[PDB]
């Protein structure tokens, strides 16, 4: 259906300018000084408000398994929540069941999302084990299924953990396929050692989670992953950056040569781990995620600073909350608490408040860290993350001047708690458009279950492999 | 005049793609897979070669006065050499006399460039002293003449040097006018002291120029510049970054918040100061520029790496050589040697060889550091530094695999020496187009004296001031 947005200020990552935008059949058809559309056309008066590209959440775990329980917000509830918060595309993590192949898991996820997602989506495939034959499936996932990104774990001893030798093999094989390599960086062996010790001191509450996974163990894994990537000459992406230490490791590496990217999430940009010490067991348990929120209160402002100067490039949510009932399964042993916090709905609002409202970065840089950088890294650029003729009509009309107190009573998540409870933000979504259709307006959501399309991605993203290709020919 | 570039691979700072480009009347009229062109239109077959935005040399001193003499390459010779090197625009520094009229010097520089320049140009206005009434003239240059950039000096005691009180006053006023504040950062008092001391010892050769201006003095001046800018909350641009020390200061400051931009030049990116110790006085004196080339051999590679990671954003040449006979006006006292080196013609080839051919950055980042970044900072963005419909037709067909050994025996400058003598680079221009007209093709240059237009620029470049505005409203 034809839709005209008039009087708006278009904000892309490279510049801002006034013009109207004309949408038709999921595409941006025209941008220009004034008029040019048929007489019958629904019209939205932006009246000076910002017209920006819909957000791309590079990290979601909507159907994540944890302690035998599935994350609380499914593909429907989850994407509905995303759209209400201004995010029009997600890249969800496929997590294979024990003893299941990668192709079987992809098919399960794909079928699931296709029947419930309210918006467009892509899929990451989590390689939980380097088994004989995995190489063939990966080739099929890249070449035929359209999956260009994969994650390997450095933590979760005896479960998902990959040894240095296996990590070297995986990075090498993945680079050959032109894939984007993601890492969950925490030293699992040392974490296992600390869990035992902490539980021995009689510490059973959530604070035990933070205490068994100190940031020094995250930073160390990040460094080791960067060392491997550097020897292999392949890009490496660090998911869920939660600490000042890990962030500095990445910063230092960037000026050295290694092609390393950093992904902080809403949680680490908007709150901290002091809440693991709440008297209320349920509130504390709701903050349990891995890596954990840093107990150092200076962390959120510091990570935002690094995102502003370019040492960190994209923002995600790591969304995968569990209800109090599900969390309670470990009311006694903190190591039995399902891991995951909310943030898919709050991401763009939280980033705007902590980065733009404070003056650390401007609106153009806001677009880059919420969509454009993500698009260039995962090979979806022009199509997504840019208001331009020919791109997909995933648009948001943002109003920098007002409204937003984050509360569990008004959020879209099905869970009881919210790690950003009480946070008042200045700047939020007014109108959300996906696939050329209005899904959020006048403070209300209007979605269609299953309307979302799966977006396949080609390997060898230029932003990543151009430098890789030169280096392989210059340093042989 | 109509011109079609066919079969090329367009390279912008944000992406690359195959499409033909159609030029008409100084503008890029169409970009696309094919078709839509009149029969009698001159066509160029790119044959898969790179089609990029013409370079922008943010730093030129074509009519610079020094020791009572004028620089060797004037507006005609200088721009001719720039075009031959792939640079289609320069922003030259107007250098006013002893407390004379800024407006009058502007008028003189403008008249010369409009009569001699081969390509479009803009003008910087150097504030050689804060004489009473300078404010009034500055306001006119900005609002009426279209000058949005001004440079202040921290060196040259009793000549151009401004005190901290004056610097503070100038940054504050210039911020008020929304200008881009450039700084020549070296501690003039300490340099004056060391010059005396070095001469007293009997060291009068060019090595004394380097010895009397150690990088510790450039770094301290740079640090102090940023400190003032932080208190005032205004953007600050560091011209001619020549040392690792100075580059590290800027890098640390970027993570802290202050809006600081760094400008390394061809000289510091492609050679070093070991040549000041050359037996050949003439050769050594040819390297005399301030700040001086660093004697540390590791400097060029280091600066290139920080340019690639984003700590330094633009590249200039600082072109303003003097013939040997002119330099020789101080063969018995290095303090009387006219300051200035070559680089305007070599800039893009040198940057390509040190940054892209080594794999530190790819072709898109190359475009950013040679034109686009400069365009955004100086408010010339969409029109310059981008291959898009509506932008000026300043284009270059670049061949990534075609050697070019730089020699004074064949360079376009008029001077006898070349600081890049013997350097063999792998990447040079094949065709250069200015204002939609071919000025370089088949190895031959064809330019029209006085064809270049003066490009006026508006104050308050969004890229710089959006953040400034937020900060002013949040930290009062």
**Chain B neighbors of A357, CB-CB under 8 A:** 470, 474
Signed CA dihedral, A364, A369, A370, A374: sign only: positive
**Chain A neighbors of B387, CB-CB under 8 A:** none
Looking at the structure, do residues B432 and B409 belong to the same domain, yes or no? no
Looking at the structure, do residues A415 and A446 belong to the same domain, yes or no? no
Helices A102-116 and A75-84 cross at an angle (nearest 10°) of 60
Geometric angle at alpha carbon A367, from A434 and B468, rounded to 5°: 145
Distance from CA of A81 to the nearest CA of B (A): 30
Total CB pairs under 8 A between chain A and B: 76
CA-wise closest residue to B26 among B384, B442, B443? B384
Look at residue A147 and give its three-state secondary structure: coil
**Resolution to 1 decimal place, in Å:** 2.1
User: Counting beta carbons within 10 angstroms of the beta carbon of residue A297, is it exposed (0 to 12), middle (13 to 18) or buried (19 or more)?
Assistant: exposed
Indicate the pairing of strand B55-60 with strand A42-45.
Answer: unpaired
Looking at the structure, do residues B164 and B299 belong to the same domain, yes or no? yes
CB B427 within 8 A of CB B357: yes
Please give the Cα distance from A378 to A191 (Å, whole number): 31
Do A381 and B15 make contact, defined as CB atoms within 8 angstroms? yes
Half-sphere exposure in the Cβ direction for B458 (13 Å, CA): 8
Signed CA dihedral, B238, B468, A396, A145: sign only: positive
Do A359 and B474 make contact, defined as CB atoms within 8 angstroms? yes
Do A255 and B305 make contact, defined as CB atoms within 8 angstroms? yes
Looking at the structure, do residues B195 and B265 belong to the same domain, yes or no? yes
Please give the Cα distance from B308 to B311 (Å, whole number): 8
E strands, B379-460, in order: 395-405, 424-434, 437-441, 444-445
**Beta sheet of A55-60, edge-to-edge order:** A55-60, A87-94, A120-127, A149-153, A180-184, A236-241, A260-264
Contact with chain B for residue A111, Cβ under 8 A: no
CB B262 within 8 A of CB B279: no
CB A347 within 8 A of CB A339: no
Looking at the structure, do residues B253 and B365 belong to the same domain, yes or no? yes
Smallest Cβ–Cβ distance between B306 and the set A255, A357, A359 belongs to A255
Smallest Cβ–Cβ distance between B359 and the set A251, A309, A467 belongs to A467
Indicate which CATH number applies to the domain containing B95: 3.20.20.140
Looking at residue B289, the DSSP 8-state letter turns out to be: -
**Beta sheet of A9-11, edge-to-edge order:** A16-18, A9-11, A50-53, A395-405, A424-434, A437-441, A444-445
Smallest Cβ–Cβ distance between B309 and the set A254, A361, A362 belongs to A254
Place of tokens 């994969």: A150
Q: What residues does A56 pair with on adjacent strands? A: A89
The percent of chain B in helix, strand and coil, each rounded to the nearest 5, is 35, 25, 40
Instruction: Identify the residue among B53, B261, B359, B376 best suited for mutation to test binding to A, counting A beta carbons within 10 A and taking the highest.
Output: B359
Please give the Cα distance from A261 to A241 (Å, whole number): 10
CA–CA distances in Å: residue B407 to residues A74, A227, B352 = 67, 41, 17
Please give the Cα distance from B153 to B159 (Å, whole number): 9
Looking at the structure, do residues A325 and A408 belong to the same domain, yes or no? yes
Contacts of B194 (CB under 8 A, 6+ apart): B211, B212, B213, B214, B217
CA-wise closest residue to B225 among B162, B305, B179? B162
CA–CA distances in Å: residue B200 to residues B193, B195, B203, B212 = 11, 9, 8, 12
Signed CA dihedral, B155, B160, B161, B166: sign only: negative
Burial letters for B437-446: b for 16+ Cβ neighbours within 10 Å, e otherwise? bbbbeeeebe
**Chain A neighbors of B360, CB-CB under 8 A:** 257, 467
Task: Dig out the tokens for A145 from the structure.
Answer: 């299924």
Task: Dig out the tokens for B133 from the structure.
Answer: 């009434």
Please give the Cα distance from A227 to B251 (Å, whole number): 23
Look at residue B46 and give its three-state secondary structure: coil
**Chain B neighbors of A361, CB-CB under 8 A:** 467
Place of tokens 């340099």: B191
Please give the Cα distance from B413 to B401 (Å, whole number): 25
Looking at residue A402, the DSSP 8-state letter turns out to be: E
Distance from CA of A300 to the nearest CA of B (A): 14
Contacts of B475 (CB under 8 A, 6+ apart): A359, B233
Distance from CA of B194 to the nearest CA of A (A): 33
A393 phi/psi in degrees, rounded to 5: -80, 60
CA-wise closest residue to B84 among B411, B437, B423, B453? B411
User: Residue A126's CB: how many other CB atoms inside 10 A?
Assistant: 20
Contact with chain B for residue A254, Cβ under 8 A: yes
Please give the Cα distance from B236 to B109 (Å, whole number): 25
CB A181 within 8 A of CB A171: yes
CB A377 within 8 A of CB A114: no
Instruction: Identify the residue among B366, B372, B390, B470 best suited for mutation to test binding to A, counting A beta carbons within 10 A and taking the highest.
Output: B470
Looking at the structure, do residues B435 and B419 belong to the same domain, yes or no? no
Contacts of B451 (CB under 8 A, 6+ apart): B117, B118, B119, B434, B435, B437
Please give the Cα distance from B288 to B80 (Å, whole number): 24
Please give the Cα distance from A263 to A185 (Å, whole number): 12
Signed CA dihedral, A372, A252, A356, A404: sign only: positive
Do A358 and B311 make contact, defined as CB atoms within 8 angstroms? no
CA-wise closest residue to B322 among B287, B279, B270? B287
Signed CA dihedral, A356, A360, A364, A370: sign only: negative
Indicate the pairing of strand A50-53 with strand A395-405.
Answer: antiparallel
**Beta sheet of A3-6, edge-to-edge order:** A27-32, A20-24, A3-6, A42-45
Contact with chain B for residue A16, Cβ under 8 A: yes
CB B88 within 8 A of CB B437: no
Please give the Cα distance from B180 to B148 (Å, whole number): 6
What technique was this entry resolved by?
X-ray
**Chain A neighbors of B298, CB-CB under 8 A:** none
Task: Dig out the tokens for B3 from the structure.
Answer: 């011109």
Indicate which CATH number applies to the domain containing A37: 2.30.40.10
Do B358 and A470 make contact, defined as CB atoms within 8 angstroms? yes
Looking at residue A275, the DSSP 8-state letter turns out to be: G
Distance from CA of A338 to the nearest CA of B (A): 35
CA-wise closest residue to A164 among A183, A139, A192, A191? A183
Distance from CA of A335 to the nearest CA of B (A): 36
Contacts of A117 (CB under 8 A, 6+ apart): A75, A76, A79, A450, A451, A452
Looking at the structure, do residues A356 and A475 belong to the same domain, yes or no? no
Please give the Cα distance from A283 to A294 (Å, whole number): 16
Q: What residues does A448 pair with on adjacent strands? A: none
| Residue A89, H or E segment | strand A87-94
Distance from CA of B463 to the nearest CA of A (A): 8
Domain count along chain B? 2
| Residue A197, H or E segment | helix A188-200
Geometric angle at alpha carbon A7, from B175 and A365, rounded to 5°: 45
| Chain B residues 360-399 with CB within 8 Å of chain A | 360-364, 376, 381-382
Task: Dig out the tokens for A29 from the structure.
Answer: 């058809």
Looking at the structure, do residues A387 and A444 belong to the same domain, yes or no? no
Please give the Cα distance from B325 to B416 (Å, whole number): 10
The percent of chain A in helix, strand and coil, each rounded to the nearest 5, is 35, 25, 40
User: Residue B47's CB: how many other CB atoms inside 10 A?
Assistant: 12
Residue where a domain terminates, one of B387, B405, B426: B426
User: Which chain B residue has the Cα nearest residue A248?
Assistant: B255
Instruction: Please tell me the total number of residues recorded for chain B in this structure.
Output: 476
Task: Dig out the tokens for A368 from the structure.
Answer: 């880059």
Looking at the structure, do residues A185 and A267 belong to the same domain, yes or no? yes
Place of tokens 């004196």: B285
Instruction: Identify the residue among B259, B309, B311, B369 best suited for mutation to test binding to A, counting A beta carbons within 10 A and taking the highest.
Output: B309
Task: Dig out the tokens for B186 from the structure.
Answer: 């070296």
Please give the Cα distance from A189 to A196 (Å, whole number): 11
- Listed as own residue / partner, the contacts of A331-335 with beta carbons closer than 8 Å and 24 or more positions apart are A331/A281, A331/A285, A332/A204, A333/A199, A333/A204, A334/A199, A334/A203, A334/A204, A334/A205, A334/A206, A334/A207, A334/A208, A334/A209, A334/A212, A334/A288, A335/A195, A335/A199, A335/A208, A335/A209, A335/A212
User: Which chain A residue has the Cα nearest residue B248?
Assistant: A255
Contact with chain A for residue B43, Cβ under 8 A: no
User: Residue A188's CB: how many other CB atoms inside 10 A?
Assistant: 22
Look at residue B95 and give its three-state secondary structure: coil
E strands, B68-174, in order: 69-70, 87-94, 120-127, 149-153
Looking at the structure, do residues A64 and A27 belong to the same domain, yes or no? no
CA-wise closest residue to B434 among B122, B121, B123, B120? B120
Task: Dig out the tokens for A297 from the structure.
Answer: 């209160």
Looking at residue B36, the DSSP 8-state letter turns out to be: -
Please give the Cα distance from B376 to B473 (Å, whole number): 23
Do B382 and A15 make contact, defined as CB atoms within 8 angstroms? yes
Place of tokens 């970054």: B241
DSSP-H helix ranges across A201-315: 207-212, 216-232, 244-256, 266-270, 281-285, 299-309
Look at residue A426 and give its three-state secondary structure: strand
**Chain B neighbors of A310, CB-CB under 8 A:** 309-310
Contact with chain A for residue B323, Cβ under 8 A: no
Burial letters for A312-351: b for 16+ Cβ neighbours within 10 Å, e otherwise? bbbbbbbbbbbbeebbbbbeeebbebbbbbbbbbbbbbbb
Indicate the pairing of strand A65-66 with strand B236-241.
Answer: unpaired
Please give the Cα distance from A406 to A403 (Å, whole number): 10
Tally: H helices and E strands in chain B: 16, 20
Full residue range of the structural domain in which residue A29 is found: 1-53+427-476
Looking at the structure, do residues A331 and A433 belong to the same domain, yes or no? no
Place of tokens 């999302």: A113
Please give the Cα distance from B290 to B304 (Å, whole number): 19
Contacts of A403 (CB under 8 A, 6+ apart): A425, A426, A428
CB B404 within 8 A of CB B428: yes
Do B362 and A251 make contact, defined as CB atoms within 8 angstroms? no
Please give the Cα distance from A331 to B145 (Å, whole number): 72
Look at residue A57 and give its three-state secondary structure: strand
CB A102 within 8 A of CB A150: no
CB B264 within 8 A of CB B369: no
Place of tokens 């980065």: A355
CB A384 within 8 A of CB A324: no
């Amino acid at each position: 259906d034809r839709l005209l947005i008039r009087g708006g200020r278009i904000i892309n990552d490279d510049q801002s300018f006034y013009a109207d935008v004309y949408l038709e059949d999921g595409l941006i058809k025209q941008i220009g000084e004034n008029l040019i559309v048929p007489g019958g056309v629904k019209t939205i008066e932006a009246n000076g408000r910002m017209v920006i590209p819909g957000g791309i959440d590079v990290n979601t775990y909507l159907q994540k398994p944890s302690q035998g329980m599935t994350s609380a917000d499914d593909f429907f509830q989850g994407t509905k929540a995303a759209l209400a918060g201004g995010t029009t595309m997600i890249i969800d993590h496929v997590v294979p069941e024990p003893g299941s192949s990668l192709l079987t898991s992809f098919e399960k996820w794909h079928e699931a999302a296709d029947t419930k997602s309210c918006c467009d989506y892509s899929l990451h495939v989590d390689i939980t084990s380097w088994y004989d034959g995995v190489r063939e499936e990966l080739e099929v996932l890249v070449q035929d299924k359209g999956v260009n990104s994969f994650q390997v774990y450095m933590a979760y001893k005896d479960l998902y953990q990959m040894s240095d030798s296996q990590l070297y093999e995986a990075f090498t094989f993945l680079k050959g396929l032109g894939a984007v390599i993601l890492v969950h960086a925490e030293n699992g062996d040392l974490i296992a050692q600390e869990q035992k010790r902490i539980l021995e001191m009689g510490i059973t509450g959530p604070e035990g989670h933070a205490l068994s996974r100190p940031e020094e163990l995250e930073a160390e894994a990040v460094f080791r992953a960067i060392a491997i990537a550097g020897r292999i000459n392949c890009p490496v992406y660090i998911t869920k950056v939660m600490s000042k230490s890990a962030a500095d490791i990445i910063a230092l590496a960037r000026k050295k040569g290694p092609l390393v990217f950093g992904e902080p999430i809403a949680a680490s940009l908007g709150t901290d781990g002091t809440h693991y010490w709440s008297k209320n067991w349920a509130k504390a348990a709701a903050f349990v995620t891995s890596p954990p929120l840093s107990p150092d209160p200076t962390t959120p402002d510091y990570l935002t600073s690094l995102l502003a100067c370019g040492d960190l490039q994209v923002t995600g949510s790591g969304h995968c909350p569990y209800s109090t009932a599900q969390k309670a399964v470990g009311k006694d042993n903190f190591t039995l608490i399902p891991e995951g916090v909310n943030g898919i709905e709050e991401r763009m609002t939280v980033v705007w408040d902590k980065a733009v409202a404070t003056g650390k970065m401007d609106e153009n840089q806001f677009v880059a860290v919420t969509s454009t950088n993500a698009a260039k890294i995962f090979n979806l650029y022009p199509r997504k993350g840019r208001i331009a003729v020919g791109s997909d009509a995933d648009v948001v009309i943002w109003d920098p001047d007002k409204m937003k107190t984050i509360t569990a009573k008004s959020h879209k998540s099905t869970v009881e708690y919210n790690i950003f409870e009480g946070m008042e933000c200045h700047g939020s979504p007014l109108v959300v458009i996906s696939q050329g259709k209005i899904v959020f307006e006048d403070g209300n959501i209007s979605v269609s279950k299953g309307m979302g399309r799966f977006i396949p991605r080609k390997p060898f993203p230029e932003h990543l492999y151009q430098r890789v290709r030169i280096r392989s020919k210059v340093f042989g």
